[PDB]
Amino acid sequence: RVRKRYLRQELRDLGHRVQTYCEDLEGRVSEAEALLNQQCE
Amino acid sequence: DYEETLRLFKTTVTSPNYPELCYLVDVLVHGNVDAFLLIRTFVARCIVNMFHTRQLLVFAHSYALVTLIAEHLADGALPPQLLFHYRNLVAVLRLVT
Amino acid sequence: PITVLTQNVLSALEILRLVRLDLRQLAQSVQDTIQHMRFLYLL
Amino acid sequence: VLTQNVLSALEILRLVRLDLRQLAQSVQDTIQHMRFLYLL
Amino acid sequence: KRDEKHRHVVNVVLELPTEISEATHPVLATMLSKYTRMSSLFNDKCAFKLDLLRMVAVSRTRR
Amino acid sequence: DEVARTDEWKGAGVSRLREVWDVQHRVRLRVLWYVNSFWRSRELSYDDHE
Amino acid sequence: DRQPLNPANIEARHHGVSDVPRLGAMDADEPLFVDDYRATDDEWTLQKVFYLCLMPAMTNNRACGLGLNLKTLLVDLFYRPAFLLMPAPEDSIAAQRQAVGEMLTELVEDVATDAHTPLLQACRELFLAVQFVGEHVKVLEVRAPLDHAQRQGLPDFISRQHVLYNGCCVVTAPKTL
């Protein structure tokens, strides 16, 4: 029971970090595409 | 005065020939608005037929279905008397409050 | 003698679209996988 | 008026690749952590 | 090969009669794409059958 | 005059409140963290190997 | 289960989306599956009035609670080629009865069908609601200390109270199911 609970907690923990990193990558690729298409004046 | 509606409810909930699919549609709907609105035409036909073929008011075994019929199936669909029975059940709940 | 010039931006737009789909699928697939493992074994 | 901007963005996209490598290493590290500890 | 896995998830798991195929049932295609990504749960085949029922239901509305 | 540790302890205050369970997840208690604690000054190290 | 539901052990149901892992956990007890919606205070009071005051008065304690094994029920009920191959038939009622199955025939036919709606049209109309299926019946234990005015004498009295989830209130024994 202890092991299952701790594994569940850690596995849920990493998914949120995955979400945040995917947000970072989405924003950065949008920035790259935007600056390639059109600059900001 | 809600005594006629309560007489009908009394005969309904103590009737051994209460339809068996009412429980199934109850456990399908969960008191979810959207699941009801999808099944909405189905249950209206069901209640009208079960009121004419036998003198009982089906889907009266659950709070969710009676209040959903009262709110959603009042735009027509139901005859006004049949609708008034569900309206009166909800009015009884308000009066107890 | 015309060796280097600006690049087509439509190619980069398609590349960005593919990356964006990849990002949505990363997030959703990770969440679905963790949930499937949780419900199958950790309950 | 555009090539300079795309290379000046590449100057940060290199750091982005670095962060991708860092996150992948972290994910593998967490999986190894869990696999070692919690699977008796 | 994927042919064996899809034949399994169509005949052994989903027990779907041969008269229903991929050419006939596009929602079955979109579901088979995701069903085979999980290897377990093949024992309680009733979970997959009900899921295909509810996906066919969500597909066949008027809204 | 001179400052007292009591007044700056109160003024510096609390900024953390964390809920911790025991290993077997029987009981929850809260941990309170203060910014004036001598804990902050030491800059000692922490680690967890597998 | 043994322990109170933590905020993370309450899972949201995804309707209209494939949810096979939830369907595998229909008989699982550790996670609790819910809709997005939470009952307000007012309708909470009305639901209590209906079940605690109206129903036992009108039935004289003749009601009971049951749960349906709706996984196998809905599978063997709707897993026909009639429902799987729903077109985006107005045959004879005999062929409709054969196609829709014996159980759905004796369940729906005289109940929810008019001259505008044959048996199979009514059964298709019912089949749509299957997309919101939900899980198997559960019984939950509710623990609550009383309000601060009732709690004063015997402060350590944790009241306990049992409720039915994914269940029905029934007034008859279902013959067909």
XYZ file of C-alpha atoms in Angstrom:
511
model
C 0.000 0.000 0.000
C 2.808 2.418 0.888
C 4.682 1.674 -2.348
C 1.598 1.975 -4.567
C 0.686 5.309 -3.000
C 4.174 6.761 -3.384
C 4.454 5.541 -6.982
C 1.060 7.062 -7.772
C 2.132 10.387 -6.268
C 5.424 10.515 -8.179
C 3.838 9.460 -11.476
C 1.187 12.159 -11.096
C 3.971 14.604 -10.188
C 5.896 14.103 -13.419
C 2.833 14.648 -15.624
C 2.473 18.237 -14.432
C 6.142 18.888 -15.210
C 5.532 17.378 -18.654
C 2.632 19.807 -19.102
C 4.706 22.834 -18.079
C 7.598 21.858 -20.356
C 5.214 21.307 -23.276
C 3.794 24.784 -22.637
C 7.340 26.167 -22.747
C 8.071 24.394 -26.031
C 4.759 25.533 -27.548
C 5.461 29.157 -26.662
C 9.039 28.986 -27.950
C 8.116 27.386 -31.280
C 5.356 29.975 -31.716
C 7.937 32.698 -31.049
C 10.311 31.222 -33.628
C 7.587 30.914 -36.261
C 6.279 34.412 -35.530
C 9.684 36.073 -35.802
C 10.303 34.182 -39.048
C 6.934 35.252 -40.479
C 6.736 38.794 -39.128
C 8.764 41.022 -36.835
C 7.290 43.227 -34.101
C 7.379 46.992 -34.663
C -54.230 21.783 -2.532
C -52.058 19.034 -4.038
C -54.236 16.117 -2.932
C -55.134 14.840 -6.409
C -51.498 14.842 -7.533
C -50.537 13.111 -4.285
C -53.256 10.490 -4.787
C -51.835 9.815 -8.253
C -48.292 9.680 -6.830
C -49.490 7.317 -4.095
C -51.014 4.898 -6.587
C -47.904 5.252 -8.767
C -45.188 4.479 -6.230
C -47.181 1.612 -4.692
C -48.082 0.042 -8.051
C -46.543 -3.379 -8.801
C -46.807 -2.761 -12.566
C -44.522 0.265 -12.488
C -42.448 -0.058 -15.686
C -39.010 -1.619 -15.424
C -37.273 0.609 -17.982
C -37.798 3.689 -15.820
C -35.029 2.476 -13.512
C -32.741 1.904 -16.500
C -33.260 5.385 -17.918
C -32.814 6.769 -14.397
C -29.426 5.107 -14.011
C -28.564 6.199 -17.551
C -29.356 9.872 -16.922
C -27.770 10.360 -13.451
C -29.701 13.587 -13.197
C -27.494 14.975 -15.963
C -29.202 17.709 -17.974
C -27.649 16.740 -21.309
C -28.413 13.021 -21.036
C -32.030 13.976 -20.364
C -32.211 16.465 -23.234
C -30.994 13.727 -25.587
C -33.571 11.226 -24.271
C -36.150 14.029 -23.938
C -38.474 13.017 -26.782
C -38.267 9.375 -25.668
C -39.355 9.948 -22.063
C -42.205 12.295 -23.011
C -43.773 9.618 -25.198
C -43.119 7.120 -22.404
C -44.901 9.164 -19.718
C -47.882 9.963 -21.938
C -48.326 6.319 -22.937
C -47.916 5.100 -19.360
C -50.489 7.623 -18.163
C -53.059 6.589 -20.761
C -52.451 2.814 -20.733
C -52.366 2.712 -16.928
C -53.307 5.299 -14.327
C -49.776 5.970 -13.107
C -47.150 8.694 -13.434
C -43.864 7.117 -14.510
C -40.410 8.489 -13.659
C -41.960 9.603 -10.363
C -39.576 7.263 -8.521
C -36.612 9.674 -8.781
C -36.054 13.300 -7.816
C -33.771 13.891 -10.789
C -36.273 12.788 -13.421
C -39.295 14.527 -11.888
C -37.483 17.849 -11.587
C -35.988 17.488 -15.083
C -39.446 16.775 -16.537
C -40.838 19.746 -14.619
C -38.202 22.141 -15.946
C -37.522 20.946 -19.490
C -40.693 19.183 -20.701
C -42.955 22.163 -19.949
C -42.492 23.858 -23.353
C -45.267 21.718 -24.756
C -44.597 18.063 -25.592
C -46.491 17.029 -22.471
C -50.220 17.712 -22.153
C -50.839 20.456 -19.584
C -52.490 18.238 -16.945
C -49.710 15.652 -16.979
C -47.158 18.452 -16.719
C -49.100 20.011 -13.846
C -48.723 16.821 -11.835
C -44.916 17.090 -11.943
C -45.162 20.840 -11.327
C -47.232 20.077 -8.236
C -44.695 17.576 -6.935
C -42.016 20.274 -7.199
C -44.386 22.762 -5.541
C -44.817 20.283 -2.672
C -41.046 20.204 -2.217
C -40.959 24.011 -2.104
C -43.806 24.077 0.415
C -42.003 21.624 2.694
C -39.065 24.026 2.536
C 26.287 34.263 -57.349
C 22.781 33.618 -55.928
C 23.806 30.890 -53.477
C 22.038 32.262 -50.364
C 18.582 33.847 -50.249
C 15.541 34.106 -47.996
C 13.595 30.930 -47.359
C 9.959 30.119 -48.001
C 7.892 30.879 -44.905
C 5.069 28.451 -45.768
C 7.447 25.553 -45.101
C 8.158 26.962 -41.644
C 4.429 27.457 -41.056
C 3.775 23.789 -41.853
C 6.671 22.850 -39.570
C 5.164 24.928 -36.755
C 1.744 23.332 -37.285
C 3.298 19.866 -37.056
C 5.141 20.870 -33.883
C 1.918 22.243 -32.362
C 0.072 19.002 -33.080
C 3.049 17.156 -31.584
C 2.767 19.305 -28.448
C -0.938 18.658 -27.966
C -0.368 14.944 -28.503
C 2.556 14.948 -26.050
C 0.472 16.478 -23.274
C -2.676 14.453 -23.942
C -0.879 11.142 -24.520
C 1.202 11.526 -21.358
C -1.918 12.299 -19.326
C -3.820 9.383 -20.889
C -0.932 6.967 -20.327
C -0.400 7.948 -16.692
C -4.147 7.667 -16.100
C -4.341 4.244 -17.754
C -1.465 2.907 -15.658
C -2.959 4.438 -12.510
C -6.394 2.894 -13.093
C -5.015 -0.479 -14.196
C -2.417 -1.123 -11.498
C -2.275 1.488 -8.738
C -5.896 1.202 -7.575
C 15.453 42.147 -42.999
C 14.623 38.627 -41.877
C 17.675 36.323 -41.949
C 19.290 38.208 -39.070
C 16.133 37.712 -36.989
C 15.919 33.987 -37.743
C 19.556 33.454 -36.733
C 19.121 35.657 -33.649
C 16.216 33.394 -32.690
C 18.383 30.335 -33.432
C 20.762 31.764 -30.828
C 18.044 30.922 -28.254
C 16.740 27.826 -30.026
C 20.098 26.222 -29.229
C 19.278 26.748 -25.546
C 15.844 25.273 -26.302
C 17.497 22.108 -27.632
C 19.588 22.030 -24.463
C 16.426 22.251 -22.361
C 14.850 19.443 -24.408
C 17.840 17.240 -23.625
C 17.605 18.219 -19.954
C 13.903 17.346 -19.759
C 14.374 13.999 -21.509
C 17.157 13.128 -19.073
C 14.871 14.128 -16.186
C 12.072 11.907 -17.512
C 14.392 8.914 -17.860
C 15.811 9.623 -14.392
C 12.324 9.676 -12.861
C 11.346 6.454 -14.621
C 14.507 4.747 -13.358
C 13.861 6.146 -9.875
C 10.345 4.710 -9.803
C 11.316 1.393 -11.418
C 14.139 0.820 -8.926
C 12.275 1.879 -5.791
C 8.616 1.058 -6.049
C 8.422 -2.217 -8.023
C 9.072 -4.953 -5.455
C 2.872 -6.561 -37.746
C -0.256 -4.544 -36.995
C -2.466 -6.905 -39.018
C -2.329 -9.579 -36.316
C -2.962 -7.060 -33.526
C -5.936 -5.488 -35.313
C -7.365 -8.897 -36.205
C -7.087 -9.718 -32.500
C -8.806 -6.538 -31.335
C -11.545 -7.159 -33.918
C -12.155 -10.927 -33.604
C -10.779 -12.143 -30.265
C -11.263 -9.084 -28.051
C -14.173 -7.273 -29.646
C -15.777 -10.516 -30.970
C -17.131 -8.412 -33.804
C -18.764 -10.444 -36.605
C -16.773 -10.519 -39.828
C -19.622 -8.772 -41.672
C -18.605 -5.561 -39.842
C -15.200 -4.433 -41.124
C -13.006 -1.339 -41.380
C -14.494 -0.258 -44.724
C -17.958 -0.051 -43.163
C -17.356 1.649 -39.818
C -15.144 4.753 -39.729
C -15.676 5.267 -35.996
C -14.317 1.741 -35.528
C -11.185 2.857 -37.395
C -10.686 5.911 -35.197
C -11.214 3.751 -32.102
C -8.918 0.946 -33.239
C -6.151 3.508 -33.597
C -6.275 4.052 -29.820
C -7.540 0.678 -28.546
C -4.392 -1.267 -29.462
C -2.102 1.204 -27.670
C -3.135 -0.615 -24.480
C -2.200 -4.286 -24.239
C -3.941 -5.206 -20.986
C -7.716 -4.959 -20.443
C -8.072 -7.489 -23.253
C -9.454 -9.930 -20.671
C -12.556 -7.914 -19.762
C -13.551 -7.504 -23.378
C -16.869 -6.026 -22.213
C -15.105 -2.732 -21.467
C -14.119 -2.321 -25.125
C -17.537 -3.369 -26.453
C -19.298 -0.800 -24.271
C -16.784 1.861 -25.289
C -17.480 1.214 -28.956
C -21.204 1.371 -28.159
C -20.864 4.776 -26.528
C -18.600 6.085 -29.307
C -21.127 4.962 -31.922
C -23.720 6.744 -29.784
C -21.737 9.996 -29.661
C -21.273 9.697 -33.425
C -24.941 9.159 -34.336
C -26.549 12.254 -32.802
C -28.396 15.021 -34.654
C -26.320 17.735 -32.940
C 18.563 51.245 21.372
C 19.025 47.684 20.120
C 16.734 45.238 18.327
C 15.381 42.085 19.984
C 15.070 38.685 18.331
C 11.418 38.491 19.444
C 10.264 41.602 17.592
C 12.063 40.688 14.371
C 10.789 37.111 14.669
C 7.225 38.429 14.789
C 7.830 41.029 12.084
C 9.570 38.670 9.666
C 6.638 36.281 10.106
C 5.613 33.052 8.403
C 5.781 32.337 4.743
C 5.073 28.619 4.138
C 2.333 26.276 5.284
C 2.665 22.707 4.089
C 0.616 19.583 4.780
C 2.598 16.422 5.517
C 1.392 12.846 5.973
C 3.088 10.022 7.795
C 4.537 7.153 5.775
C 1.427 4.975 6.032
C -0.876 7.934 5.239
C -2.826 7.656 8.487
C -2.470 11.208 9.788
C -2.003 14.682 8.318
C -0.266 17.544 10.090
C 0.875 20.957 8.912
C 4.431 22.296 8.937
C 4.927 26.000 9.614
C 8.004 27.765 8.249
C 9.399 31.071 9.476
C 11.758 33.380 7.629
C 13.553 34.494 10.812
C 14.558 30.944 11.776
C 18.238 30.192 12.224
C 17.479 27.364 9.794
C 17.805 29.888 6.965
C 21.285 31.105 7.883
C 23.134 27.790 7.819
C 23.027 27.034 4.051
C 23.575 23.348 4.800
C 23.025 20.753 2.077
C 20.251 18.245 1.408
C 20.208 15.129 -0.752
C 18.150 12.005 -1.450
C 19.756 9.041 -3.175
C 17.593 6.225 -4.492
C -12.967 2.464 0.894
C -10.923 2.275 4.125
C -9.924 5.983 4.065
C -11.713 9.252 3.199
C -11.610 10.372 -0.418
C -8.693 12.733 -0.877
C -9.180 15.585 -3.374
C -7.047 13.657 -5.874
C -9.054 10.407 -5.585
C -12.154 12.022 -7.107
C -12.029 11.635 -10.886
C -14.011 13.540 -13.508
C -15.982 11.557 -16.072
C -15.217 12.330 -19.724
C -18.452 11.867 -21.631
C -18.412 11.876 -25.408
C -14.787 10.688 -25.327
C -13.421 7.149 -25.304
C -12.860 6.230 -21.667
C -11.976 2.502 -21.669
C -9.754 2.774 -18.543
C -12.721 4.202 -16.619
C -14.900 1.419 -18.008
C -12.384 -1.107 -16.708
C -12.679 0.571 -13.300
C -16.481 0.292 -13.169
C -16.261 -2.077 -10.204
C -13.170 -0.396 -8.740
C -13.667 1.448 -5.456
C -10.437 3.377 -4.820
C -11.236 6.275 -7.206
C -14.618 7.978 -7.234
C -15.986 9.046 -10.613
C -18.118 12.191 -10.790
C -19.533 14.719 -13.204
C -18.269 18.284 -13.347
C -21.415 19.519 -11.618
C -21.821 19.949 -7.851
C -25.282 20.220 -6.316
C -26.112 23.635 -4.890
C -27.387 24.135 -1.354
C -30.970 24.760 -2.496
C -31.344 21.679 -4.687
C -29.463 19.728 -2.021
C -32.245 20.639 0.421
C -34.933 19.792 -2.136
C -33.381 16.388 -2.850
C -33.323 15.699 0.886
C -36.982 16.728 1.168
C -37.929 14.403 -1.675
C -36.095 11.338 -0.392
C -36.427 11.718 3.392
C -39.890 13.272 3.758
C -42.020 12.695 0.643
C -41.037 9.173 -0.395
C -41.271 7.375 2.985
C -44.589 9.130 3.633
C -46.058 8.040 0.299
C -44.554 4.540 0.326
C -44.670 3.748 4.079
C -41.094 2.374 3.963
C -41.832 0.157 0.936
C -38.987 1.477 -1.229
C -35.542 -0.076 -1.628
C -32.257 0.700 -3.352
C -30.708 -1.406 -6.093
C -27.791 -1.177 -8.490
C -27.648 -2.443 -12.066
C -24.697 -4.327 -13.541
C -24.998 -1.933 -16.445
C -21.698 -2.941 -18.056
C -22.923 -6.403 -19.049
C -26.524 -5.174 -19.209
C -25.787 -2.479 -21.784
C -23.340 -4.727 -23.642
C -25.685 -7.668 -24.172
C -28.609 -5.258 -24.624
C -27.234 -2.869 -27.259
C -24.338 -4.788 -28.838
C -26.498 -5.736 -31.824
C -25.738 -4.956 -35.471
C -28.853 -2.761 -35.299
C -27.159 -0.388 -32.864
C -23.554 -0.701 -34.036
C -24.521 -0.072 -37.681
C -26.821 2.874 -36.979
C -27.274 4.856 -40.208
C -26.617 8.586 -40.138
C -36.089 0.839 -41.302
C -39.908 0.716 -41.029
C -39.934 -3.057 -41.518
C -42.536 -5.316 -39.950
C -42.526 -5.379 -36.159
C -41.434 -9.025 -36.235
C -38.129 -8.264 -37.953
C -37.670 -5.262 -35.656
C -38.170 -7.469 -32.603
C -35.636 -9.981 -33.887
C -33.088 -7.273 -34.723
C -33.384 -5.356 -31.454
C -33.341 -8.417 -29.208
C -35.754 -10.152 -26.865
C -34.949 -8.103 -23.756
C -35.219 -4.700 -25.437
C -38.407 -5.910 -27.138
C -40.155 -6.822 -23.900
C -38.712 -3.741 -22.203
C -39.568 -0.989 -24.694
C -42.276 -2.187 -27.076
C -45.628 -1.372 -25.479
C -44.068 1.297 -23.233
C -42.365 3.965 -25.352
C -43.644 3.404 -28.915
C -46.381 5.255 -30.794
C -47.701 4.961 -34.329
C -45.056 7.537 -35.314
C -42.241 5.533 -33.673
C -41.841 1.802 -34.319
C -39.950 -0.422 -31.895
C -36.516 0.009 -33.483
C -36.770 3.794 -33.765
C -37.589 3.993 -30.050
C -34.729 1.647 -29.172
C -32.296 3.742 -31.218
C -33.571 6.845 -29.423
C -32.873 5.147 -26.096
C -29.475 3.883 -27.311
C -28.180 7.442 -27.619
C -28.184 8.003 -23.844
C -25.709 5.105 -23.462
C -22.908 7.569 -24.241
C -23.225 8.931 -20.660
C -23.079 5.487 -19.033
C -21.308 5.935 -15.688
C -20.133 3.235 -13.297
C -21.526 0.485 -11.071
C -23.419 0.992 -7.820
C -21.493 2.158 -4.765
C -22.320 2.769 -1.120
C -20.458 5.665 0.477
C -19.896 6.406 4.156
C -20.293 10.055 5.155
C -18.604 11.290 8.327
C -19.418 14.671 9.816
C -19.062 16.327 13.215
C -22.098 18.420 14.072
C -22.283 22.203 13.868
C -20.492 24.297 16.453
C -23.615 24.609 18.615
C -24.448 20.892 18.579
C -20.804 19.839 18.875
C -20.322 21.385 22.317
C -21.328 18.358 24.390
C -19.593 15.239 23.123
C -17.173 17.115 20.831
C -15.755 13.836 19.502
C -19.002 12.422 18.069
C -18.301 11.800 14.383
C -21.681 11.039 12.841
C -21.779 8.399 10.116
C -24.256 8.099 7.305
C -24.619 5.890 4.238
C -25.737 6.850 0.734
C -26.134 5.071 -2.601
C -24.154 6.241 -5.623
C -24.779 5.128 -9.219
C -27.895 3.549 -7.735
C -31.652 3.711 -8.034
C -34.611 4.033 -5.702
C -37.012 1.263 -6.653
C -40.579 0.526 -5.607
C -40.877 -2.819 -7.430
C -38.628 -5.760 -8.119
C -37.702 -5.548 -11.832
C -38.813 -8.739 -13.560
C -36.957 -8.279 -16.841
C -33.638 -7.081 -15.389
